[PDB]
Amino acid sequence: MEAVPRMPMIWLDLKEAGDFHFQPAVKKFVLKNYGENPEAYNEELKKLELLRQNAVRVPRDFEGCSVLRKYLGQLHYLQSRVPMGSGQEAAVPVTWTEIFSGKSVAHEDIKYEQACILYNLGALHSMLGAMDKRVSEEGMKVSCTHFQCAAGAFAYLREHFPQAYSVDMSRQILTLNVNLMLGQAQECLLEKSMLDNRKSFLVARISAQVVDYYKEACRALENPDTASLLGRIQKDWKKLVQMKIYYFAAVAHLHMGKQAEEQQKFGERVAYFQSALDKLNEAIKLAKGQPDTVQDALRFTMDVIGGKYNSAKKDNDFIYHEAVPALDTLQPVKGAPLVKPLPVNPTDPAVTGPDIFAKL
């Protein structure tokens, strides 16, 4: 299982930005309230504008993440000095395209701009994580960190922006995103633990956790309101995710099988391999029409499980003659969480650089 072909990963698209004309409001505030010249601060507003234009047309690569967090940070620094929140004096319309329906959604609130940049940070992390092939030592560790970063960004949005500015950032949908990301992160670690050939029982528990994350995500997908918004996207995700639910349940029981054979419980060895074979077969049925990357993972895994089941059932029928216990009676595999939504510090000076609006 060290060498199993990698499953493909889900990633989210970035939102499309409308206009955020903050400079006339900033200047009209600093003349009216401090009593200064408008044009006294035109380099620190112009730098912000070049920073925003760069963020909303962000390069789809690792450097692009730092670009988004600098702008996220600079946006906070501005709000700390100029009141551009909902209902406040210098508030200007912020417009963004809601990613699933394509509708323009506008809010006279700077936190809306912050929220969308945060979303795109999460989406971009999901992209970087999913394009890697996860074969090298360096792809597996970084993909996992990217997916945790994605989860962390969406989780931060869920907590600090409870007002759903638009339905693509509603709480149940951000929850879906978080669980999807943690699932893919956990999946990366499972692949790593199988490469490192960790204790069979530990691998089983890790795989069981992959199942728990994907199940939560799958639950969210069977929600009518979520299903209607996502549209086709719901059907693509669900078909991959539902398939993976049975696949990693099979991987989990494969390793419960290997543990059983390590402990000389050779009747239970057969039970776990049989169970793994049935669950894998359901996965294969659910995987019809899916790309060859999926099919190659499943057929590699079937030769592993198929071979061990045959070996296990046979030495048991001729040598050990122990009864094959019903799964019911055997202790359930509990998931082992190894991943967490990595917290975002928007105003970390190491990522924001000097405050553009230091003078103010």
Residue numbers in the entry: 1 to 360
Authors' text:
HD-PTP is a non-receptor type protein tyrosine phosphatase (PTP) that contains five domains (Bro1, V, central proline-rich, PTP and second proline-rich domain). Considerable evidence has also indicated that HD-PTP and Myopic, the homologue of HD-PTP in Drosophila melanogaster, are involved in the morphogenesis of MVBs and in the endosomal sorting of cargo proteins, including integrin, Wntless and Wingless, and EGFR, and that the Bro1 domain is necessary for these processes. Thus far, two ESCRT components have been found to interact with the Bro1 domain of HD-PTP: the ESCRT-0 protein signal-transducing adaptor molecule 2 (STAM2) and the ESCRT-III protein charged multivesicular body protein 4B (CHMP4B). A recent report indicated that HD-PTP is the central regulator of EGFR sorting that functions to coordinate the transfer of EGFR from STAM2-containing ESCRT-0 to CHMP4B-containing ESCRT-III.
To verify the direct binding between the two proteins, we prepared the recombinant HD-PTP Bro1 domain containing residues 1–361 (referred to as HD-PTP(1–361)) and the STAM2 core region containing residues 260–370 (referred to as STAM2(260–370)). Similar to that of Alix or Brox, the Bro1 domain of HD-PTP adopts a boomerang-like fold containing a concave binding pocket, where the C-terminal tail of CHMP4 may be accommodated. We noticed that in our HD-PTP(1–361) structure, these residues (together with neighboring residues Arg205, Ala336, and Leu338) form hydrophilic and hydrophobic contacts with Asn33 and Tyr34 from an adjacent HD-PTP monomer, suggesting that the crystal packing interaction between HD-PTP molecules will prevent STAM2(350–370) from being accommodated in HD-PTP(1–361). We note that both the interaction of the STAM2 peptide and the insertion of the N33A and Y34A mutations do not induce a dramatic conformational change of the HD-PTP Bro1 domain, as our HD-PTP(1–361) and HD-PTP(1–361;NAYA) structures overlap each other greatly when superposed with a RMSD value of 0.61 Å over 355 aligned residues. Nevertheless, together with a slight conformational change of α1-α2 loop, a remarkable difference in the arrangement of the HD-PTP molecules was shown in the two crystal forms, which allows STAM2(350–370) to be accommodated in HD-PTP(1–361;NAYA) and the complex structure to be determined.
